[PDB]
Amino acid sequence: ATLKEVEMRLKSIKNIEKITKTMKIVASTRLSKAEKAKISAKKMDEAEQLFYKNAETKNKELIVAITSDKGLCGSIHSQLAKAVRRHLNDQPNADIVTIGDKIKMQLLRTHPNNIKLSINGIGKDAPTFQESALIADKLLSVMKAGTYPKISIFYNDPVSSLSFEPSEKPIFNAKTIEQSPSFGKFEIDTDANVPRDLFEYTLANQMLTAMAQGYAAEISARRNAMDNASKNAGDMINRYSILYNRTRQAVITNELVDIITGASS
Amino acid sequence: ISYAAYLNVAAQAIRSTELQTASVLNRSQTDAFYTQYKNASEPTPITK
Amino acid sequence: RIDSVSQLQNVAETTKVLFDVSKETVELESEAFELKQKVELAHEAKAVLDSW
Amino acid sequence: AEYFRDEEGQDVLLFIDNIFRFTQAGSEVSALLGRIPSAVGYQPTLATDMGLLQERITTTKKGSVTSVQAVYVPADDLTDPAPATTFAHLDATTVLSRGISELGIYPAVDPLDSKSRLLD
């Protein structure tokens, strides 16, 4: 009546609560793995950053960002979208490679000359080297990544275990090594063609590092967002409990008048 | 092909001796697509 | 330098056209008052007559 | 209101606070008179009794009659027959509710619960 309609909606809230509980639990298990991977990646990459630093640097233009194909995990997807957008104030038509289905849809609106290359099937998978390598190799061929003066990579940095701030680092072009302040303490002749090779190899290694942070940030956000969902859903359970209790009394009292009027007559 | 795609293959051979864990195989084996794109317009996906 | 100086000259002349025209329109509202009065009086006469 | 309506052709208004209180009074008298109360508590003679005042508020060619009427809603249930049976006898409403009152929106008129016969 009113009654059954109360009871079913309270159920709906319950089922929702039950699934967000389930999720947070599965999120905690994934998360541990995620953060451990990210130390190793950062540390490996860091050994290259040491070079890039000492060497110094002089880093259209490309944008990469890394996100989940699967929807829901917090505001990971659209806070990441604000930061892409910030750097698309340089050139409005600049070419975005979307590792992640979600961000692509949103960007395609804001400017349509952005989506050029896109990937798929990353979101259900971990930050593993194979994915990064193939995409890097394809980035050279399709998109001609070695032409660019700037390459920039976006991810969401897992700031503290309860937060994520969208963050960046620049993949350094082959061009940087050559003309940078010091290449005299990284002297060469014809012993190797270090730029064209060192560049390729750091496309995949820096991009991987970015996937690892992003993954750790996403799974962390997800846990927190679902954690908050249970709370807000609980609050509705408790209000709807007052609704159920009033709904039950009303049905019984209105019903009594009916039997009484009949009996009198 | 790239210098780092050749390292990648070298890494692939290395994933199989049998002693190696599940994650190792994933750093060396993925079945995915990559959505080809141009313009809005899309050529259809192909396996990465 | 010529660009600035020309604007002053050209602008200074033409704004006088709007300054006169605008106030003339205000003069028209005095004549408008006679129009308004005729409407009041006719509405008044019509109203009584409908009642008749 | 009718003298102004009939004899004179001069403009009328009506403001009412509340004609729910007319309905409320009917429920109170109902038992004593010799009627058997219908469900909720409202009179078994509600449509006929309601009918007579609201057909004595009606436009004639002797003059138009703009009316503004107010209905007091008890327990805020609008699904009770005394508030409900009024809408049929209405052209327009601008329903006011407790919820929009809490939200701080004054006037408290529901913006999704307003209707008119002048809407087209």
User: Can you give the CATH number for the domain in which B9 is found?
Assistant: 1.10.1620.20
Please name every residue paired with A118 in a beta bridge, in sequence order, or none if there are none.
Answer: A98
* CB-based burial label for D22 (10 Å; 0-12, 13-18, 19+): middle
Nearest by Cα to A94 from A24, A154, A164, A49:
A154
Tokens of D54: 């609201």
Residues A39 and A18 reside in one and the same domain: no
| Mutation choice for B interface testing from A64, A98, A103, A129 by most B CBs within 10 A | A129
Q: Note whether A141 and B5 are within 8 A (CB).
A: no
For residue A173, give the 3-state DSSP assignment: coil
Residues A32 and A77 reside in one and the same domain: yes
Q: Is A265 on the interface with D (CB under 8 A)?
A: yes
Asked whether the CA dihedral D23, D27, D28, D29 is positive or negative, the reply is positive
Per the structure, the complete domain to which residue A3 belongs is given by: 1-25+226-265
Per the structure, the complete domain to which residue B48 belongs is given by: 1-48
Q: How far is A227 from chain D (nearest CA, A)?
A: 28
Residues A10 and A30 reside in one and the same domain: no
Please name every residue paired with A163 in a beta bridge, in sequence order, or none if there are none.
Answer: A160
| CA torsion, ordered A46, A52, A58, A59, to nearest 10 deg | -40
Residue A214 Cα distances to A207, A218, B32, C49, angstroms: 11, 6, 19, 84
For residue A122, list chain B residues with Cβ-Cβ distance below 8 A.
32
Q: Note whether A172 and A62 are within 8 A (CB).
A: no
Task: Give the total number of structural domains in chain B.
Answer: 1
Residues A155 and A35 reside in one and the same domain: yes
Residue C6 Cα distances to A18, C10, C14, C19, angstroms: 76, 6, 13, 21
Nearest by Cα to A169 from A105, A110, A83:
A83
Asked whether the CA dihedral D98, D101, D105, D106 is positive or negative, the reply is positive
Residues A74 and A160 reside in one and the same domain: yes
Tokens of C5: 């100086």
Q: How far is B17 from chain A (nearest CA, A)?
A: 18
Residues A172 and A261 reside in one and the same domain: no
For residue C23, give the 3-state DSSP assignment: helix
Tokens of C22: 């605008």
Nearest Cβ partner for A130 among B3, B26, B34 = B26
Residues of A near B (CB-CB distance < 8 A)? 101, 108, 112-113, 115-122, 125-126, 128-131, 133-138, 140, 196-197, 200-201, 203-205
Please name every residue paired with D63 in a beta bridge, in sequence order, or none if there are none.
Answer: D60
- Which chains touch A (3+ CB pairs under 8 A)? B, D
For residue D41, list chain A residues with Cβ-Cβ distance below 8 A.
257
Residue A153, number of CB atoms within 10 A of its CB: 24
| Mutation choice for D interface testing from A239, A255, A261 by most D CBs within 10 A | A261
Q: What's the CA gap between A1 and C5, in Å, rounded?
A: 82
Residue A248, number of CB atoms within 10 A of its CB: 14
Q: Note whether A55 and A177 are within 8 A (CB).
A: yes
Residue A106 φ/ψ, nearest 5 degrees = -70, -45
Tokens of A58: 């002089």
Query: A164: phi > 0 → left, psi -120 to 50 → alpha, else beta; which?
Result: beta
Residue A182, number of CB atoms within 10 A of its CB: 10
Please state whether at least 3 CB pairs lie below 8 Å between chains A and C: no
Task: Give the total number of structural domains in chain A.
Answer: 2
Question: What letter would DSSP give residue A66?
Answer: E
- Method of determination? cryo-EM
Please name every residue paired with A86 in a beta bridge, in sequence order, or none if there are none.
Answer: none
| Mutation choice for A interface testing from B1, B16, B35 by most A CBs within 10 A | B35
Cis omega (within 30 of 0) for bond into A195: no
Nearest Cβ partner for B39 among A112, A120, A137 = A112
Residue indicated by tokens 């451990």: A36
Radius of gyration of chain C (CA): 23
Residue D78, number of CB atoms within 10 A of its CB: 15
Please name every residue paired with B47 in a beta bridge, in sequence order, or none if there are none.
Answer: B33
Please state whether at least 3 CB pairs lie below 8 Å between chains D and A: yes
Q: Note whether D3 and D12 are within 8 A (CB).
A: no
- Host H or E run for residue A95: strand A95-99
Q: What's the CA gap between A245 and A27, in Å, rounded?
A: 36
Instruction: State whether A258 and D39 contact (CB < 8 Å).
Output: yes
Residue A7's domain is classified under what CATH number? 1.10.287.80
Asked whether the CA dihedral A258, A262, A264, A265 is positive or negative, the reply is positive
Q: Note whether A73 and A218 are within 8 A (CB).
A: yes
Residue A231, number of CB atoms within 10 A of its CB: 11
Residues A121 and A242 reside in one and the same domain: no
Contacts of B5 (CB under 8 A, 6+ apart): A133, A134, A136, A137
Residues in chain C: 52
Residue A44's domain is classified under what CATH number? 3.40.1380.10
CA-based end-to-end distance of chain A: 27
Residues A96 and A112 reside in one and the same domain: yes
Q: What's the CA gap between D41 and A37, in Å, rounded?
A: 71
Residues A151 and A252 reside in one and the same domain: no
Q: What's the CA gap between A130 and D4, in Å, rounded?
A: 91
Nearest by Cα to A47 from A214, A213, A201, A211:
A201
Q: Is A261 on the interface with D (CB under 8 A)?
A: yes
Residues A44 and A162 reside in one and the same domain: yes
Residues A184 and A258 reside in one and the same domain: no
Q: What's the CA gap between B35 and A135, in Å, rounded?
A: 11
Radius of gyration of chain A (CA): 27
Residue A4, number of CB atoms within 10 A of its CB: 9
Residues A240 and A112 reside in one and the same domain: no
Residue type for position C32: A
Residue A66, number of CB atoms within 10 A of its CB: 29
Residue indicated by tokens 């639990």: A25
Pairing of strands D93-96, A115-118: unpaired
HEC per residue, A65-104: EECCCCCCCCCHHHHHHHHHHHCCCCCCCCEEEEECHHHH
